[PDB]
Design a protein around this ligand. Structure first.
Ligand SMILES: *[C@@H]1O[C@H](CO)[C@@H](O[C@@H]2O[C@H](CO)[C@@H](O)[C@H](O)[C@H]2NC(C)=O)[C@H](O)[C@H]1NC(C)=O
Ligand SMILES: *[C@@H]1O[C@H](CO)[C@@H](O[C@@H]2O[C@H](CO)[C@@H](O)[C@H](O)[C@H]2NC(C)=O)[C@H](O)[C@H]1NC(C)=O
Ligand SMILES: *[C@@H]1O[C@H](CO)[C@@H](O[C@@H]2O[C@H](CO)[C@@H](O)[C@H](O)[C@H]2NC(C)=O)[C@H](O)[C@H]1NC(C)=O
Ligand SMILES: *[C@@H]1O[C@H](CO)[C@@H](O[C@@H]2O[C@H](CO)[C@@H](O)[C@H](O)[C@H]2NC(C)=O)[C@H](O)[C@H]1NC(C)=O
Ligand SMILES: *[C@@H]1O[C@H](CO)[C@@H](O[C@@H]2O[C@H](CO)[C@@H](O)[C@H](O)[C@H]2NC(C)=O)[C@H](O)[C@H]1NC(C)=O
Ligand SMILES: *[C@@H]1O[C@H](CO)[C@@H](O[C@@H]2O[C@H](CO)[C@@H](O)[C@H](O)[C@H]2NC(C)=O)[C@H](O)[C@H]1NC(C)=O
Ligand SMILES: *[C@@H]1O[C@H](CO)[C@@H](O)[C@H](O)[C@H]1NC(C)=O
Ligand SMILES: *[C@@H]1O[C@H](CO)[C@@H](O)[C@H](O)[C@H]1NC(C)=O
Ligand SMILES: *[C@@H]1O[C@H](CO)[C@@H](O)[C@H](O)[C@H]1NC(C)=O
Ligand SMILES: *[C@@H]1O[C@H](CO)[C@@H](O)[C@H](O)[C@H]1NC(C)=O
Ligand SMILES: *[C@@H]1O[C@H](CO)[C@@H](O)[C@H](O)[C@H]1NC(C)=O
Ligand SMILES: *[C@@H]1O[C@H](CO)[C@@H](O)[C@H](O)[C@H]1NC(C)=O
Lengths: 80, 415, 100, 49, 50, 40
């Protein structure tokens, strides 16, 4: 649901009742996603959502914060 | 001829917008405004509504690709070493500041504060960008760390570390000035670099209209949105500009005409707005492509194209994020303090002509010397730095002189 | 609306650029303009495409004659053929037709 | 292998437009043309001009 | 129509400025960017609208 | 990476030793001394 402080999805509107006021709710900047489980990990970006959040399919659908890339560091010494 | 004897390092600012504000308009709600009769009447007109929605969505998608092409160009994310010993150089202005909210560098903070910026309307909406400001800052920091520690090697293959003064020596050797010029003047170069970067912040802060380009985009987009909103309250040749009065005060049969007039007017206004947005988006896309090219060709490597990055002989560059664009800090080499000499195309010794391998023949009045072409450094003429070709008759401006053989003294001493 | 820059000032810019590039070489685009004789500038420019300086200093007359001949032929080539300046006239015609 | 033994110096022209002709059209005068009734009627249409 | 034509003319003017800066003000090593062959130099001449 | 023995043909002399920082000592072979000694 786009840009809604979703405390009122059932009022806002069969099988739709599963995706209306479900067991999983996660408020984001772009709205809130129903039917996906939040994850503390971070992977590459599948189907985007907004504000640096990409949903994906692992089963189940997971919403996570995007990961830019693998961390790296070069051993910099003044004579190497 | 006139050869300079001294140089100056300068830093120049460049600003290029790379993105717009993603937006979408409720096509049916804007024209109708939650009315059943209006929707029923609009159903006759066909599929203009879907066309407008598809065009706006296509415009909104491309901004994310613009940002992705401009910034996301490094496979990995690099990190600056905890200890900073760069041979006398100072990067505290561009590198991220740890003891600070968020992670923006002081120059980025100044840029974000300088730009002056948004509401909810009837059918209009704004979609948040795919990449937040922190991620763009992380991209810029990764690029900056990679170019500080590795050079241009991190844009081709695996990153390979190298001391900074050696990288700068390579970059002078890349414009026809030997390494010893930097290696014998390291402290002065460091001082000039630090002073130029320090002056950049004051130059940005003093003039209020320094940006002038990222603000115009915001102003004109806001003007377009405001005039689109204001177009809603117009008679358009109808009895009234509000549907409720027409519906209530008048019966339907001669009210469909007024409703149709209002629908035609609002549809025309929306179509004009969409067309203008399409043209502006094309312009912004061209600018973003140019910015991506400048990134890839100047930040990730030294450029030989004249006046592409800064005015002068290009050295290297530093990106900085901006609210809806990117800022470049081109570092260039500019000579100064020139004085004239007298030349000659060739030197005639032993009946044969001689030409310089790298440089020119000059003399300060009596004695001839070979020097470079961008820094006056005389050298004694020997066989090592000249090559012979043909006789002296064919060349026009030959002169009378001698060239020494370094082997002769040793050979005479040791038979 | 009249143009901001009259044709005389545009000609003055072009003349300044031309004088700078004949006299000072490419230096006037980097910093202060620096003197250099023209045959040495062409020696630099041959050296810049992988050809040593020998060819020019021993063939100065030939290159000068070919340069003069080519410049002379340019006038005839762009004058005799009527359909040379096509893009400019096309733009003017398009604007005039749309306004009409 | 092949290696040239002689060269020719040649020049070539190239043409690029850089500017259009500046122009402007008055919306009210074009649409109405010295008529107060037309101007009053057009005032309702909004701010297209 | 005028807006679209003006955008095209702006693109052409940008290309002309790039050619001026890259070839009049210095030698260029991009192939076939300035002429057909190994580029040496260039000279600008004005025109009515170009 | 193809290392080579430092001689006087791949290096050029410039200036004095103390002006530059980071200098290190080594020897630089001269390709003429052997044949010079071969003809005493
Ligand atoms: C080249 O320019 C630099 C600065 O642009 C000169 O450095 C100055 O030299 C004066 C005279 O000795 C002293 O005040 C300082 O050493 C420098 N001053 C500043 C403000 O930097 C330098 O002397 C010039 N010449 C050479 C050969 O380097
Ligand atoms: C031209 O330059 C040369 C070298 O730079 C000068 O030769 C030296 O000049 C100084 C000062 O006059 C003398 O102390 C040296 O003995 C000269 N060198 C030798 C090998 O004798 C020369 O004087 C300059 N000529 C000018 C400036 O007219
Ligand atoms: C550079 O120009 C000067 C004059 O501007 C040339 O000096 C002349 O050289 C010719 C050589 O045949 C003499 O016959 C003249 O008498 C000289 N003129 C004067 C006023 O002395 C000089 O030759 C030119 N240099 C080159 C390499 O062509
Ligand atoms: C440079 O030196 C050469 C060699 O000494 C000069 O050549 C002489 O020129 C005179 C001029 O009439 C002749 O009479 C001599 O016979 C020449 N000598 C030889 C060995 O050929 C030359 O004039 C000098 N100046 C230049 C080349 O400009
Ligand atoms: C290289 O080409 C030029 C012309 O393209 C040749 O110059 C011509 O030479 C013939 C015979 O000497 C003359 O009849 C012509 O008048 C010359 N033309 C010009 C424009 O000077 C030159 O001979 C060629 N080089 C070689 C080595 O054959
Ligand atoms: C760098 O090399 C020079 C000579 O190669 C070293 O000079 C030595 O100086 C000491 C006394 O100061 C003498 O006893 C030696 O005979 C000199 N030569 C050598 C080969 O040792 C110089 O000391 C070296 N640099 C440093 C920092 O030690
Ligand atoms: C959304 O509701 C929650 C709790 O009611 C709270 O975060 C806040 O009141 C709302 N957030 C908004 C309106 O941004
Ligand atoms: C991990 O996930 C849980 C449940 O979503 C959340 O409460 C917690 O803040 C997350 N982070 C850490 C560090 O536990
Ligand atoms: C070798 O290089 C790696 C990084 O490539 C660095 O971590 C390590 O400390 C270096 N070791 C030595 C002995 O130079
Ligand atoms: C770099 O400049 C800043 C300017 O305030 C200064 O505080 C800092 O000490 C400088 N860096 C070093 C290594 O001295
Ligand atoms: C340098 O130029 C000045 C005048 O521009 C002239 O008087 C002087 O002689 C020139 N220097 C030399 C070495 O010819
Ligand atoms: C490199 O850094 C170390 C410690 O900062 C210092 O002792 C050493 O002299 C430096 N190397 C050079 C060539 O200055």
């Amino acid at each position: 649901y786009q840009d809604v402080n979703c405390t009122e999805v059932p009022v806002a509107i069969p099988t739709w009742r599963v995706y209306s006021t479900g067991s999983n709710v996660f408020q984001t900047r772009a709205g809130c996603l129903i039917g996906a489980e939040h994850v503390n990990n971070s992977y590459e970006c599948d189907i985007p959502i907004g504000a640096g959040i990409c949903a994906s399919y692992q089963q189940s659908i997971i919403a996570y914060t995007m990961s830019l890339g693998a961390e790296n560091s070069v051993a910099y010494s003044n004579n190497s | 001829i006139a050869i300079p004897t001294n140089f100056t390092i300068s830093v120049t600012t460049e600003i290029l917008p790379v993105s717009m504000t993603k937006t979408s308009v409720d096509c049916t709600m804007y024209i109708c405004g939650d009315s059943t009769e209006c929707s029923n009447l609009l159903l006759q007109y066909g599929s203009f509504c879907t066309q407008l929605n598809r065009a706006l969505t296509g415009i909104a998608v491309e901004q994310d690709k613009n940002t992705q092409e401009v910034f996301a160009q490094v496979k990995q994310i690099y990190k600056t070493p905890p200890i900073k010993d760069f041979g006398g150089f100072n990067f505290s202005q561009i590198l991220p500041d740890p003891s600070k909210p968020s992670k923006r560098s002081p120059i980025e903070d100044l840029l974000f504060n300088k730009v002056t910026l948004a509401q909810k309307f009837n059918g209009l909406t704004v979609l948040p960008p795919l990449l937040t400001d922190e991620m763009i800052a992380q991209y810029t920091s990764a690029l900056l760390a990679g170019t500080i520690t590795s050079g241009w090697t991190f844009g081709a293959g695996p990153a390979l570390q190298i001391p900074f003064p050696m990288q700068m020596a390579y970059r002078f050797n890349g414009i026809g000035v030997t390494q010893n010029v930097l290696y014998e003047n390291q402290k002065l170069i460091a001082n000039q670099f630090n002073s130029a970067i320090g002056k950049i912040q004051d130059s940005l802060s003093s003039t209020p209209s320094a940006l002038g380009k990222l603000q115009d985009v915001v102003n004109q987009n806001a003007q377009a949105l405001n005039t689109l909103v204001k177009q809603l309250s117009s008679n358009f040749g109808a009895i009234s500009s509000v549907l409720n009065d027409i519906l209530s005060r008048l019966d339907p049969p001669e009210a469909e005409v007024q409703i149709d007039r209002l629908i035609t007017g609002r549809l025309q206004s929306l179509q004009t707005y969409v067309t203008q947005q399409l043209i502006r988006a094309a312009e912004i896309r061209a600018s973003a492509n140019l910015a991506a090219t400048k990134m890839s060709e100047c930040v990730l490597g030294q450029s030989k194209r004249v006046d592409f990055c800064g005015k002068g002989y290009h050295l290297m560059s530093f990106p900085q994020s901006a609210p809806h664009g990117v800022v470049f800090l081109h570092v260039t080499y500019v000579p100064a303090q020139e004085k004239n000499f007298t030349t000659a195309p060739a030197i005639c010794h032993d009946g044969k002509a001689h030409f310089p391998r790298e440089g020119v023949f000059v003399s300060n009045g009596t004695h001839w010397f070979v020097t470079q072409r961008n820094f006056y450094e005389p050298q004694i003429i020997t066989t090592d730095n000249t090559f012979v070709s043909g006789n002296c008759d064919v060349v026009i401006g030959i002169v009378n002189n001698t060239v020494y053989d370094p082997l002769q003294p040793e050979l005479d001493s040791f038979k």
